[PDB]
Structures are given as structure tokens and as C-alpha cells.
Amino acid sequence: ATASPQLSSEIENLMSQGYSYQDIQKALVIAQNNIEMAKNILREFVSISSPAHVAT
Helix, strand or coil, X not given: CXXXXXXXXXXXXXXXXXXXXXXXXXXXXXXXXXXXXXXXHHHHCCCCCCCCCCCC
């Protein structure tokens, strides 16, 4: 319950990096909708095809 904007913003954090929402939601199920545990799982697991991430 309670769609918290900040926790959802956590998704947006790695989302902005190019990460895929399919695996993002996947990260949430293992991370029990955690902040860092989800963004960390994407880092650990799924990869990004988007070119130039740290180009800013």
C-alpha cells in the first residue's frame, strides 16, 4: 500500500541510467521493494545496452 514517491524515485534513479523496468520490477521482488537492494540487483544482474552512461 501507499505508493511512496521516493521509493518509486529509487527506481527512477537506476532507470535514468538506462536500466530496464522488466528487471527493475524483478529486482524489487527479490529486494522486497527495497531502495538500494533493487538498484543493486540490476547492477549485479541485468545490463544496459544504452551507450555512454557516465558521459556527464
